[PDB]
Amino acid sequence: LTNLVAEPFAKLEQDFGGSIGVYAMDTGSGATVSYRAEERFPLCSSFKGFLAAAVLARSQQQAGLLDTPIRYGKNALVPWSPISEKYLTTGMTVAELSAAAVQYSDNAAANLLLKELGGPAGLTAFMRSIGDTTFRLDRWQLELNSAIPGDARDTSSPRAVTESLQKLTLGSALAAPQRQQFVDWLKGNTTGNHRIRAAVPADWAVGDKTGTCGVYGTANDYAVVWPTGRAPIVLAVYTRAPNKDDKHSEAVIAAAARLALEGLGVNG
Ligand SMILES: *C(=O)[C@@H](NC(=O)[C@H](N)c1ccccc1)[C@@H]1N[C@@H](C(=O)O)C(C)(C)S1
């Protein structure tokens, strides 16, 4: 049921000047679209969705975790921290940091939450615990964005991202209240309007998390999509390019998502 219908991903990545990795899953029939799906690509900020899921998992065992206030000093503010910078003088709750990391890709909030989980190895351990043997986080923001060609640190594959996203949003990896909260955070994301969402009709529900490393044409998005009248679709789109100063493209991510949906026979 893989690639029942061929799509021109090769021409798309050639026009972009890099590599594109795609894995899309129709959760009803099990049919898939797959292109470079088992290659490693840098996560960039897309790790933060899984970080929020790991926080929610912990909260099943710590009833008070989400409401815990976290205070932080100016030395915790990283470039691109649009929410946490407004609460420096007050603090934010764990739930609010999680929402900011997912929905604004707030870099300081993500580092604070990583600390709570025991750092990159603690997030990697959570992904191992849901059966993902590919994902690895090695460093913190912003060093994890280096996107060096051939470097396996801070990478996963489009396929493993999609498989883990499915387990967390639709499967049994989180208890039902935490599952819906993860979904609601993804649905409220603000940074993805020009990526997978641009290929999804306005009358369908969707949640996503983006990543943009800033170098090596490296950027990405993953999403769960609920077309009306059929089962949901889970997909991941990752890009990279050979030269440090190659620019990323939002349009190429949207175009790859359109091809994935066409390949699954989802009318959009
Ligand atoms: C994670 O990927 C973060 N990326 C960065 O901080 C980069 N230094 C950067 C690249 C391009 C423009 C500004 C910063 C954050 N997540 C990105 C995303 O979710 O697409 C981001 C651009 C919102 S910042």
Residue numbers in the entry: 25 to 57, 59 to 252, 254 to 294
Paper quotes:
KPC-2 (Klebsiella pneumoniae carbapenemase-2) is a globally disseminated serine-β-lactamase (SBL) responsible for extensive β-lactam antibiotic resistance in Gram-negative pathogens. Carbapenems, the most potent β-lactams, evade the activity of many SBLs by forming long-lived inhibitory acyl-enzymes; however, carbapenemases such as KPC-2 efficiently deacylate carbapenem acyl-enzymes. In KPC-2 and other class A SBLs, the active site (containing the nucleophilic Ser70) is bordered by the flexible Ω-loop where the general base for deacylation (Glu166) resides. We present high-resolution (1.25–1.4 Å) crystal structures of KPC-2 acyl-enzymes with representative penicillins (ampicillin), cephalosporins (cefalothin), and carbapenems (imipenem, meropenem, and ertapenem) obtained utilizing an isosteric deacylation-deficient mutant (E166Q).
To investigate the interactions of members of these different antibiotic classes with the KPC-2 active site, we utilized the isosteric Glu166Gln substitution (KPC-2E166Q)13 to slow the deacylation of the acyl-enzyme (allowing resolution of the acyl-enzyme intermediate). Pre-formed KPC-2E166Q crystals were soaked with solutions of ampicillin, cefalothin, imipenem, meropenem, or ertapenem, representing three different β-lactam antibiotic classes (penicillins, cephalosporins, and carbapenems) for a range of exposure times, and diffraction data were collected. The resulting data extended to a high resolution (1.25–1.4 Å) with a clear Fo – Fc difference density in the KPC-2 active sites, enabling confident modeling of the antibiotic-derived complexes in which the cleaved antibiotic is covalently bonded to Ser70. The penicillin C-6 2-amino-2-phenylacetamido substituent was modeled as a single conformation in which all atoms could be resolved. For all the structures presented here, KPC-2 could be modeled as a continuous chain (residues 25–293) with the respective Ω-loops (containing Gln166) all present in single conformations. However, analysis of the B-factors of the Ω-loop (residues 165 to 170) in structures of KPC-2E166Q acyl-enzyme complexes other than ceftazidime (for which a weak electron density precluded modeling of the Ω-loop, that is, with ampicillin, cefalothin, cefotaxime, imipenem, meropenem, ertapenem, and faropenem) shows a negative correlation with steady-state kcat values, indicating that faster antibiotic turnover rates are related to a lower average mobility of the Ω-loop. In the case of carbapenems, therefore, efficient deacylation can in part be attributed to the relatively well-defined conformations of the Ω-loop in the relevant acyl-enzyme complexes, although comparison with substrates of other classes (e.g., ampicillin and cephalothin) for which the turnover is faster and Ω-loop B-factors are lower indicates that these are not completely optimal.
